[PDB]
Design a protein around this nucleic acid. Structure first.
Ligand SMILES: Nc1ccn([C@@H]2O[C@H](COP(=O)(O)OP(=O)(O)O)[C@@H](O)[C@H]2O)c(=O)n1
Ligand code: BEF
Ligand SMILES: [Mg+2]
Length: 505
RNA sequence: AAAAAAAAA
C-alpha cells in the first residue's frame, strides 16, 4: 500500500477550522469551553487530514503528554455530526487500547466533551472492557445505542463474536491508540481478528473503514505490521518529530542511579523519596515502576511501613480487581500528592496531572516503554524529572537505549547503601522466607525474558538478581532453597548458572 | 514461574 511522510508551518486554531468549514459549530464550543492555550502541534497536523475526502489511513506520531487523545477524538465527533441522519443507532468508530484503565480514560475524555456541550450527548459512548459485568455493558449498549466504542482487544472480540450484526455493521473509523504495542506479538493476532470481523461485516464495502494509528514511539516498520489491518491504498505518516530526534520528551530531566547490587536500588529509591518528601515538605506526587507484580506488592509493603505516615501509597497492577483499579486511578488523578507503585499497566497512555517525577526500580518490559514510563510526567506543558535505579549489570540497557532509542541519560550517579538504612528497611519486612522466594524467582523469570532484547549477560545478570534473596535476609552467602524437580523445570540444570543461584534442598 | 490482554485471565 502507498505510504507518504510529512515531517514538521502555518498555525491552526479552533476558530480557523471553524471558518474553513472542516469543523461544525457544536464541536467548537466543547474544546473552546475547555479553555486550552491552543491546539497541540499534533492536533493541528492531524485533524484536517482525517476528515479529508480522500480515501486514506494515517499513522501519526507525537511525544508523550501532547493531547494525542483529542487529536483523533475530535475528528470522530466531527464525522458523527456529518452523518447524524444516517445510521444514528450504530457504532461508527471503534477505539482500541492496550490496558483497561486507558480505555476507560479515553471514555472519560469523551465524557468531558459531553460536559462542555450537552448537545453532543446524542452521540453516546460505551466502554467494552474486561473485568466489568458483561451483561451490564450490552444492556448499556442497547439502551444508549452509541456511535463511539472504546474497548480492550479481548473483551471487544467477545462482544464482536456475539453481537456484530447489531452494532458494528456501519463502522467508518478504527483507532489504534498505542498502536505499536497493539501490533506487538500477543496483540497482533487479536487486532487482525478485530479488523477482519469489522471489514467482513461493513455494509458498504470491506475497505470502507479508515484506520488511525497513534503512539509516542513509532517508525515506518509499523506500516508493515499493520498492512493486514489497513484497507486504504494511501497512508499518511504525520510526524511532529525529526527522524533522529529522541522520541522522549525534552522537558523531562532524566537521571540514572547506578548501583553495585540489584537490591541496593531499593535502598537508593527510599533515600531519594525520603529526601524528596522533606525537601518538598510532603506535597509530593510520584510514580514508581517495577518489573514484576510480586515485587510491586513487596515494594509497596516497604513504602507503606516507611512513608504511609507522610503520603498515601497506592498499589496498581493486573492482579488487583478491576473495581479497585478504576477507583485508585480516579483518586490519583485528583490527589495532589501520593506514591503510585505500579507495573507496566500504567506505563502507557494513563494521564495523572501534575506528577513531579517518575521512579524506576529496574527496567521496563519493553525498551520503548522507557519512553512511555517517564512520559507520565511533564504532560500538558508541565515540567518533571525521572530517576532510573539500576545496578552494575543493567548498563547494557542504558547503552542499548543510546544505540537504538537514541536516548542517553545526561546525569549518571553511582550509589552504595549505608548500613544504618539497610537495618531500617530489612527490619520493616513482614514477609516470611517462603514468600520472599516467590518475589525473587519472579524477578529472575522477568529478567531472563529480556536478555536478548537488552543485550544483557545471562552469565552475570541472572546470578546478581537471584542474589537479592540473600540480601533481604542479610545473608549474601545464602541461596534460594529449591527441589531438584523445580530446578530442572527451569532448564538451568544444563548451565553453571543454575548452581550459582540455587541450592538443592 | 514471567508485563498486558474475553463473562474459565
Ligand atoms: N490541546 C490540548 C490537548 C490535551 N490537553 C491536555 O493534555 C492531557 C493529556 O493529553 P493526552 O494524554 O491526550 O496526550 P498523549 O499523552 O496521549 O499524547 C489532557 O488531560 C488534556 O487536559 C491540553 O491541555 N490541550
Ligand atoms: F499517550 Be501518550 F504516550 F502519553
Ligand atoms: Mg495517549
Amino acid at each position: 500500500s502507498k505510504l507518504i511522510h510529512v515531517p514538521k508551518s502555518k498555525e491552526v486554531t479552533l476558530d480557523s477550522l471553524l471558518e474553513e468549514g472542516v469543523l461544525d459549530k457544536e464541536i467548537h464550543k466543547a474544546i473552546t469551553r475547555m479553555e486550552f492555550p491552543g491546539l497541540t502541534p499534533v492536533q493541528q497536523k492531524t485533524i484536517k487530514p482525517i476528515l479529508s475526502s480522500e480515501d486514506h489511513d494515517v499513522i501519526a506520531r507525537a511525544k508523550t503528554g501532547t493531547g494525542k487523545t483529542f487529536a483523533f477524538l475530535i475528528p470522530i465527533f466531527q464525522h458523527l455530526i456529518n452523518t447524524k441522519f444516517d445510521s444514528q443507532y450504530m457504532v461508527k468508530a471503534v477505539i482500541v487500547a492496550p490496558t483497561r484503565d486507558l480505555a476507560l480514560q479515553i471514555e472519560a475524555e469523551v465524557k468531558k466533551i459531553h460536559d462542555m456541550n450537552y448537545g453532543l450527548k446524542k452521540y453516546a459512548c460505551v466502554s467494552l472492557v474486561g473485568g466489568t459485568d458483561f451483561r451490564a455493558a450490552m444492556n448499556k449498549m442497547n439502551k444508549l445505542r452509541p456511535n463511539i466504542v472504546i474497548a480492550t482487544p479481548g473483551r471487544l472480540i467477545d462482544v464482536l463474536e456475539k453481537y456484530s450484526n447489531k452494532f458494528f455493521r456501519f463502522v467508518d473509523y478504527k483507532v489504534l491508540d498505542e498502536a505499536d504495542r497493539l501490533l506487538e506479538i500477543g496483540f497482533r493476532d487479536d487486532l487482525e481478528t478485530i479488523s477482519g470481523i469489522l471489514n467482513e461485516k461493513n455494509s458498504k464495502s470491506a475497505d470502507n473503514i479508515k484506520t488511525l494509528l497513534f503512539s509516542a514511539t513509532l517508525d515506518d516498520k509499523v506500516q508493515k505490521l499493520a498492512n493486514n489491518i489497513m484497507n486504504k491504498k494511501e497512508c499518511l505518516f504525520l510526524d511532529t518529530v525529526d527522524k533522529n530526534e529522541p522520541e522522549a520528551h525534552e522537558r523531562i530531566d532524566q537521571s540514572v542511579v547506578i548501583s553495585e547490587k540489584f537490591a541496593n536500588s531499593i535502598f537508593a529509591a527510599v533515600e531519594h523519596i525520603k529526601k524528596q518528601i522533606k525537601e518538598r515538605d510532603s506535597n509530593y506526587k510520584a510514580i514508581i515502576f517495577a518489573p514484576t507484580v510480586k515485587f510491586t506488592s513487596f515494594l509497596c509493603s516497604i513504602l507503606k511501613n516507611e512513608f504511609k505516615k507522610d503520603l498515601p501509597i497506592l498499589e496498581f497492577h493486573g492482579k488487583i480487581t478491576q473495581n479497585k483499579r478504576t477507583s485508585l486511578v480516579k483518586r490519583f488523578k485528583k490527589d495532589e500528592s501520593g506514591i503510585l507503585v505500579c507495573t507496566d499497566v500504567g506505563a502507557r497512555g494513563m494521564d495523572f496531572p501534575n506528577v513531579h517525577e517518575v521512579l524506576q526500580i529496574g527496567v521496563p518490559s519493553e525498551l520503548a516503554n522507557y519512553i512511555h514510563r517517564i512520559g507520565r510526567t511533564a504532560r500538558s506543558g508541565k515540567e518533571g524529572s525521572s530517576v532510573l535505579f539500576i545496578c552494575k549489570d543493567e548498563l547494557p540497557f542504558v547503552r542499548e537505549l543510546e544505540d537504538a532509542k537514541n536516548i542517553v541519560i545526561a546525569k549518571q550517579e553511582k550509589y552504595e547503601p549505608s548500613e544504618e538504612i539497610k537495618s531500617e528497611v530489612l527490619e520493616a519486612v513482614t514477609e516470611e522466607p517462603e514468600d520472599i522466594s516467590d518475589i525473587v524467582i519472579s524477578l529472575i523469570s522477568s529478567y531472563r525474558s529480556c536478555i536478548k532484547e537488552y543485550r544483557f549477560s545471562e552469565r552475570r545478570i541472572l546470578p546478581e538478581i537471584a542474589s537479592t534473596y540473600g540480601v533481604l535476609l542479610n545473608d549474601p552467602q545464602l541461596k534460594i532453597p529449591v527441589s531438584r524437580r523445580f530446578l530442572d523445570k527451569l532448564g538451568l540444570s544444563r548451565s553453571p548458572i543454575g548452581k550459582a543461584m540455587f541450592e538443592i534442598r
